[PDB]
Amino acid sequence: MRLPYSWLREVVAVGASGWDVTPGELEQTLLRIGHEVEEVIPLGPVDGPVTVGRVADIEELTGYKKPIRACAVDIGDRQYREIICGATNFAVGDLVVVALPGATLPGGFTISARKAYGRNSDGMICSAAELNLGADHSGILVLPPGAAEPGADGAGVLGLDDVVFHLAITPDRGYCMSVRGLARELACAYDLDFVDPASNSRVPPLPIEGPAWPLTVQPETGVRRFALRPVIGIDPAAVSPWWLQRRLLLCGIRATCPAVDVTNYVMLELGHPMHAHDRNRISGTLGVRFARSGETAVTLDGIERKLDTADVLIVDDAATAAIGGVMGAASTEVRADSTDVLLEAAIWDPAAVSRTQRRLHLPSEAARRYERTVDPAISVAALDRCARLLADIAGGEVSPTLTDWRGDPPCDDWSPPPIRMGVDVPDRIAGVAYPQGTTARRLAQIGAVVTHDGDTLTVTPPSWRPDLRQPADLVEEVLRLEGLEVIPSVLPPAPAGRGLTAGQQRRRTIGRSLALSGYVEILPTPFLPAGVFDLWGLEADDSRRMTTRVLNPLEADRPQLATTLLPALLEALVRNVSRGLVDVALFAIAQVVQPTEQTRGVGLIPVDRRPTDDEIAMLDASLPRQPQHVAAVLAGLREPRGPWGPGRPVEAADAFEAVRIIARASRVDVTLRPAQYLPWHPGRCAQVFVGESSVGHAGQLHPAVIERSGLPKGTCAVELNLDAIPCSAPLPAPRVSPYPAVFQDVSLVVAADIPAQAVADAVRAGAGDLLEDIALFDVFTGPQIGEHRKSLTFALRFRAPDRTLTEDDASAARDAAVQSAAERVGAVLRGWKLA
Amino acid sequence: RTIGRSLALSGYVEILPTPFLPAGVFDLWGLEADDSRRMTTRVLNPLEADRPQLATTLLPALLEALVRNVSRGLVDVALFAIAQVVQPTEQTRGVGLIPVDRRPTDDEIAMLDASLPRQPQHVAAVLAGLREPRGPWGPGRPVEAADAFEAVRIIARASRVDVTLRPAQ
Amino acid sequence: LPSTRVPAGARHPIIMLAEHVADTFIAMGWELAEGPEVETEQFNFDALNFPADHPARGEQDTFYIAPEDSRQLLRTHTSPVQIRTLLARELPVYIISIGRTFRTDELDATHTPIFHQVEGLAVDRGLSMAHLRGTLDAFARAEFGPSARTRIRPHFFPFTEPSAEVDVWFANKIGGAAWVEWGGCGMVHPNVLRA
Amino acid sequence: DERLATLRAERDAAVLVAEGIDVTLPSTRVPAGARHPIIMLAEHVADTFIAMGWELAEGPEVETEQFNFDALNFPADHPARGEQDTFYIAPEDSRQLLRTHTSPVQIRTLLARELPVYIISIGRTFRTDELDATHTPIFHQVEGLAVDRGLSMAHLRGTLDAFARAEFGPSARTRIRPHFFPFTEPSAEVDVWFANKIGGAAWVEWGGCGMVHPNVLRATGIDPDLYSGFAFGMGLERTLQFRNGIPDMRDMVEGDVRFSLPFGVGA
Ligand SMILES: O=C(Nc1cccnc1)N1CCC(Cc2cccc(Oc3ccc(C(F)(F)F)cn3)c2)CC1
């Protein structure tokens, strides 16, 4: 909302004459009581000969791209100057504003008598924007007849010493979308007496003698008030005086004709939107009703609107007269020939206006005020104010008839219910001991009726403050007018908290451990890439395809939420690689979204109580499962090149080691088992287990997936479900025998299909507790042991808890380990030695 | 905390270092008679008569833990410690009793502090044997000086500072 | 000679900022709570005193889960976590919720549709705006240095009353200390407590 | 062309099995290390108290007699000030020693900071005990001190119970019995109810506590008629010994990697 300081000042000055403040101080006062000042715009300075002129001749220059005019302009004292101008929105006889040689316009533009378009031009005719007066629109500024004489000083006529304040009003303060509301706020901030410009001393009531027009209202439309009053015999050729056109311009409204200008003007002054109908274009009774399915209306911009059954209309016998509270209709619109006007002062349902205008994308000046609730007590004051102004400007007569529907039954008292509050509640909420009388004084200032009864205040807010419903609402009024800056800064005592949960600590430890091992964390987008699971070649019934879908994604082809973190990680990997960073290891820790059913919403639970435990469980059960995952991808060199050697390319074993890094960080033991699971390579894919629970997969990606997706060759990947890895808090008590150890190596031949870990497990089971350590040294294949067999050499370390092991006790334990391997995996002993 | 986490992830095992120096350690090291590390605070009543000197350097305690691991057959070891040392700047000087019916003054506090040996925090590490173990990937890789330089870099990254290394004797 | 054969990685700077924020509040006795990013409309809007026809409940600002009118969405703040925590735990409650939140902003230099928020809620007997300011100043000192502090100006949010915007005095640097808008605050609205 | 592709496919599928690996082979070429279990216990203790608003303070292990004994209300001829229990710095009567507790850190903190003060001091302390299964001359202690207006024994018990729950589980709690220390009055010994395990829940002695003695407040310039304070201390090696069931303290101090590695990295 835009308004000029002069207007605001004039309204404040009625009750406090002489009041006047600098723009900087006004800005600061508005910020501290809660109004955001987006911009302070002093009307840009002019200097030198910028004066009113009168166009006395127009010659059309031909031959150029555009139409161009050479104008004789009267600039005062019977002096005429030739001026070239490209605008077309003016005629001979019009008052305009000329910047003549020697003048300077805002932005440092000096005017000189240049030669333009073949003729000499002694200056220019100015637009409102070139004067920094108002919005840049097509054509130059034309002042209304009689506004000033040729030669009058531009700065003074235009009022260029004004300042326009551009505010962003919050939706709880609809009453501030007008000079009435902001001036009242200023009166509160500065402790002034305030004269309400909507009051009866300032808007004396007009006569009330018979209905102004037949009206039916279906009350379930939520209309609260609907008043009409006619003005007859206005001159359709009259234009608004300059003072009115100017204020409209500074508030961002272009003047068009008095009947419309006056409704816009009174809207800005008092905050009650107003509309002017051509009464001779109304056919029969005016009806307020909901639209029907499929119904259409043409608004006064000539655009056809598809209506909704929740849209409230004004109709007559023949057509729609308005989309109520949003925009008037073409059929009753004031036109160039309109002589008899019916003025509409209505109060619509805020939510109804809010839904309708957003559906139609019509955030009009009226709609935005009705959305935030317009004061229903001033409809006839605004109607009367607006009829007088129109009759005076356009030379009509105000008819003494008035329709004023005030509900079924009529409502004669508009203020909200009384609110009841302890006198010191604001002091407690603020942590400030305000002087006595403070909250009652501030609550009267904003217009409430306040009565005292011991220590409890009863507060009845005014009708323009529908936001004041509870004690907290009143606290805010007291605190913001006192100023939040007086509230001290006092650290509370927070309780003895328990710190981070075990899960929270684990997710920190996993991140630290992966980062130290060379992985770089990314923040993964939950919006899956288009067609990713077809690139992966997943089966139609793969659970990962069962995705929750977003209705309004920013990219139409990416509406599916991620069931797996790998797509986001591979997308970051491709990005790094395409920028020349080809040796990369990335990880992410984030939830996924895994629905178990079709989207099911749970109906509104009443908010005047807490939901029950069963309602909470039902809300939870309606959501997709959202477990925490950890995942990582690797490509390129795992070990970089340097003086030590050529480096080492990423291999599947690096993904297995990432599993082990995460398991150590989680303090759990994992086992890895061969698996076939896209998008992994079937021969280089491990499924990961904690106990007998599957927690995810790791290994090298499938070469066909790599190739279809444009991934680096040999890319490896890991994804684990953190929710499936049990919590663990071990309390170790390691036995540390100091007696000497015995070292032996053993080589065992097994079928090639036997996993090395199964052999190690068997060796461990047979050797017993004397076996302190076992490590796989060598995997050897060759023709002399059989084409489908392999030799595994294990280093064994034996140690007794209470004595020096004999080398023969060690060999007894080795014999038992060999036998166990023989019985469990069919191992055959090839040889052993002392290490 | 960050230095300890970073060294532990890189394969080092933390020890709690004894502050009682081994007997004759700086003669074993061949230090000059005027080496500042020989200027030790001494304990009057140590549990071992021949170990009364408090450590000016953490390496002796770390090497003693290293020898212990190695003598028990754990020959591929990397140890670290984070602990204060004791570095006197003068002969033992006591400060007389300040009356306890009041608080000491700021000057008395500074005098008490100035009478104590400097006690800065050190981080140290020792490595021997295989840095990378033997396995199916190959024979492993013995500890080399470059592994000690990398420990410096691990500590510097953990500290968020840049270091440079310069030849020294 | 270079010695680094295992190059260092890096946790994400946003995660590390979140970690520092969390530690700042843990050290004052608060705890951290978490919740789902796909959330019910009940906890994202209704429990937070948004009117039924508030514009935030539309597709212009919020990602909704298909189909239409499913009352399921990507959360627009982490406040539903504090609602869940108020339902689950006994008073008094001092809870930080840090997490991923979603808005229909296009990605550009100063906007992202996926972002991370910290929100705090303290509910106890006799808490005031002064305690709010004290906690905000402690928070500011921890993230911007011992010379930082906050100021508040009146504003509006559906779930607080009174409501304010928070500026932080950013001394350490910026090219010349100035006030920077940091976020929003207020006293939790009685309707939120009732629900 | 029905079967150009079916066995062109099952050709490529056997290329994939021909390049299979044993996914169970060892992969760890940088073996994990380990922060020390006592350091990790200290870290958990510190976090427990940080999360209640306390802060951690540190100080020198070679300390003045002023802060180790005199400021702590030890009489001039108290036996603890002798060579039988305390390591003294040579020569004789130097008023310099290896600290026998971390309390001198709280004295230093009371001198340096404004009240109220809620301070944990964890650190290395020294006693002339021979190293054996349940003693070490070098050990680690946690001591806390809270000094504020209106602190009572009830607040002491609340902090002790919170501490116990954090280190021993939600079923733990503490009990106190009257005892004596020069720096507290009243003084008590703390037992912890060790439920989680032990082979059958029982009370275990954990450490000492009490209300800080008014002479300690006077020697730091604090008015004991306005401020009161509670204090407590426990040994980390002793706590680890009875909580984990570690029978030989020599393992905690000798530096064998086999003691540390089963506790994990500690990141
Ligand atoms: O550790 C131990 N003994 C041990 C022996 C050998 C090996 N392992 C363990 N015990 C046994 C002794 C006991 C002493 C004690 C008693 C009461 C409160 C304490 O805490 C304080 C004291 C003073 C202050 C200050 F404010 F006045 F400064 C602040 N806190 C400390 C601590 C635990």
Question: How large is the C-alpha radius of gyration of chain A?
Answer: 42
Out of A472, A480, A626, closest to residue C190 by CB: A472
Mutate to test the pocket of ligand 1, among D183, D206, D216, D227 (most ligand atoms within 8 A of CB): D183
Could you tell me if D252 and D37 are in contact, meaning their C-beta atoms sit under 8 angstroms apart?
A: yes
Q: Of A716, A714, A770, A717, nearest to A743 (Cα)? A: A770
Torsion of CA A524, A525, A527, A533, to 10 degrees: -30
C6 CB neighbours in chain B (<8 A) are 10
C7 CB neighbours in chain A (<8 A) are 518, 640
Torsion of CA D69, D70, D71, D72, to 10 degrees: 50
Range 35-54 of D in CB contact (< 8 A) with A: 37, 47-48, 50-53
Q: Tokens representing B161?
A: 């500072």
| Cis preceding-peptide flag for A679 (omega within 30 of 0) | yes
Region(s) of chain A under CATH 3.50.40.10: 215-405
D207 lines ligand 1 (CB under 6 A): yes
| Amino acid (one-letter) located at D44 | H
DSSP code of residue A614: H
A66: Cα separation from own chain's centroid: 43
Instruction: Give the list of residues 6+ apart from residue C6 with CB closer than 8 angstroms, or none.
Output: A517, A518, A639, B10, D30
Number of Cβ atoms within 10 Å of the Cβ of A104: 15
Instruction: Give the list of residues 6+ apart from residue B160 with CB closer than 8 angstroms, or none.
Output: none
Could you tell me if A800 and A770 are in contact, meaning their C-beta atoms sit under 8 angstroms apart?
A: yes
| Cα–Cα distance, A2 to A167 (Å, whole number) | 6
| Cα–Cα distance, A9 to A164 (Å, whole number) | 12
Could you tell me if D171 and D196 are in contact, meaning their C-beta atoms sit under 8 angstroms apart?
A: yes
Chain D interface test: which of B100, B111, B123 (most D C-beta within 10 Å): B100
Homologous superfamily (CATH) of A508-724 is Bira Bifunctional Protein; Domain 2 (3.30.930.10)
Task: Kindly give the distance from the C-alpha atom of residue D209 to the centroid of ligand 1, in angstroms, as a whole number.
Answer: 7
Domain A419-486: CATH architecture, name and number where available: 2-Layer Sandwich (3.30)
Query: What separation in angstroms does the CA of A131 have from each of A141, A249, C21?
Result: 9, 13, 51
Could you tell me if A418 and A224 are in contact, meaning their C-beta atoms sit under 8 angstroms apart?
A: no
Torsion of CA C43, C45, C49, C55, to 10 degrees: 180
* CB hemisphere CA count around D15 (13 angstroms): 9
CATH class of B1-169: alpha beta
Look up the CATH number of domain A215-405.
3.50.40.10
Q: Tokens representing D89?
A: 């710095």
| Cα–Cα distance, C137 to C185 (Å, whole number) | 13
* CB hemisphere CA count around A211 (13 angstroms): 8
Number of Cβ atoms within 10 Å of the Cβ of A93: 9
Q: Is A515 exposed, middle or buried (0-12, 13-18, 19+ CB in 10 A)?
A: buried
Strand C31-33 and strand C93-102: pairing? parallel
At A42, phi and psi to the nearest 5? -65, 135
DSSP code of residue B87: B
End-to-end CA distance of chain D: 59
Strand order in the sheet with A419-422: A419-422, A456-460, A449-453
Region(s) of chain A under CATH 2.40.50.140: 50-163
| Cα–Cα distance, A251 to A167 (Å, whole number) | 11
DSSP code of residue D72: G
Q: Tokens representing A495?
A: 């309780």
Neighbours of chain A (3+ CB pairs under 8 A): B, C, D
Could you tell me if A526 and A562 are in contact, meaning their C-beta atoms sit under 8 angstroms apart?
A: yes
Nearest protein Cα to ligand 1, atom 8: D235
Instruction: Give the list of residues 6+ apart from residue A769 with CB closer than 8 angstroms, or none.
Output: A801
Q: Tokens representing A228?
A: 């009409």
User: DSSP readout, A630-681?
Assistant: EEEEEESEEEPPBTTBS-EE--HHHHHHHHHHHHHHHT---EEEE---TTEE
Homologous superfamily (CATH) of A50-163 is Nucleic acid-binding proteins (2.40.50.140)
| Cα–Cα distance, C9 to A519 (Å, whole number) | 5
Phi-psi region of D154 (alpha: psi -120 to 50; beta: other; left: phi over 0): alpha
Q: Is A265 exposed, middle or buried (0-12, 13-18, 19+ CB in 10 A)?
A: buried
Q: Report which secondary-structure segment, H or E, holds C87.
A: helix C79-88
Region(s) of chain A under CATH 3.30.70.380: 741-834
| Cis preceding-peptide flag for D186 (omega within 30 of 0) | yes
| Cα–Cα distance, D53 to A497 (Å, whole number) | 8
| Cα–Cα distance, A322 to A331 (Å, whole number) | 9
Q: Of A338, D36, A636, C169, nearest to B15 (Cα)? A: D36
Q: What angle do CA A744, A747, A753 make, to 5 degrees?
A: 140
Could you tell me if C133 and C33 are in contact, meaning their C-beta atoms sit under 8 angstroms apart?
A: no
Instruction: Give per-residue burial for D76-111: e unless 16+ CB within 10 Å, then b.
Output: eeeebbeeeebbbbeeeebbbbbbbbbbbbbbbbbb
Region(s) of chain A under CATH 3.30.56.10: 419-486
Q: Of A675, A715, A795, nearest to D23 (Cα)? A: A675
| Cα–Cα distance, D9 to A481 (Å, whole number) | 79
Could you tell me if C56 and C79 are in contact, meaning their C-beta atoms sit under 8 angstroms apart?
A: no
| Cα–Cα distance, D25 to A128 (Å, whole number) | 81
| Cα–Cα distance, B98 to A165 (Å, whole number) | 70
Could you tell me if A251 and A245 are in contact, meaning their C-beta atoms sit under 8 angstroms apart?
A: no
The size of the C-D interface in CB pairs under 8 A is 10
Q: Is C161 annotated as a binding residue?
A: yes
Q: Tokens representing A718?
A: 């890991």
Please state the atom number of ligand 1 nearest to the C-alpha of residue D135. 7
Paired with B142 in beta bridges are: B130
Q: What angle do CA C116, C118, C122 make, to 5 degrees?
A: 160
A20: Cα separation from own chain's centroid: 38
Could you tell me if A230 and A343 are in contact, meaning their C-beta atoms sit under 8 angstroms apart?
A: yes
Could you tell me if B61 and D254 are in contact, meaning their C-beta atoms sit under 8 angstroms apart?
A: no
D157 lines ligand 1 (CB under 6 A): no
Please state the atom number of ligand 1 nearest to the C-alpha of residue D229. 26
Please state the atom number of ligand 1 nearest to the C-alpha of residue D105. 28
- CATH pick for A741-834 out of 3.40.50.720, 3.40.50.2300, 3.30.70.380, 3.30.950.10: 3.30.70.380
| Cα–Cα distance, B92 to B44 (Å, whole number) | 11
D74 lines ligand 1 (CB under 6 A): no
Mutate to test the pocket of ligand 1, among D129, D148, D181, D220 (most ligand atoms within 8 A of CB): D181
Q: Tokens representing A164?
A: 């326009």
Q: Tokens representing D99?
A: 């600290």
Dihedral sign (CA A31, A34, A39, A42):
negative
Number of Cβ atoms within 10 Å of the Cβ of A797: 18
D141 lines ligand 1 (CB under 6 A): yes
Helix, coil or strand: residue B166: coil
At D141, phi and psi to the nearest 5? -130, 150
Could you tell me if B93 and B115 are in contact, meaning their C-beta atoms sit under 8 angstroms apart?
A: yes
| Cα–Cα distance, A603 to C46 (Å, whole number) | 11
| Amino acid (one-letter) located at A61 | L
Helix, coil or strand: residue D105: helix
User: DSSP readout, A674-735?
Assistant: E---TTEEEEEEEEEEETTEEEEEEEEEPHHHHHHHTPPTT-EEEEEEGGGS----------
Helices (H) and strands (E) in chain A, counts: 20, 41
Please state the atom number of ligand 1 nearest to the C-alpha of residue D141. 1
| Cα–Cα distance, A454 to A433 (Å, whole number) | 19
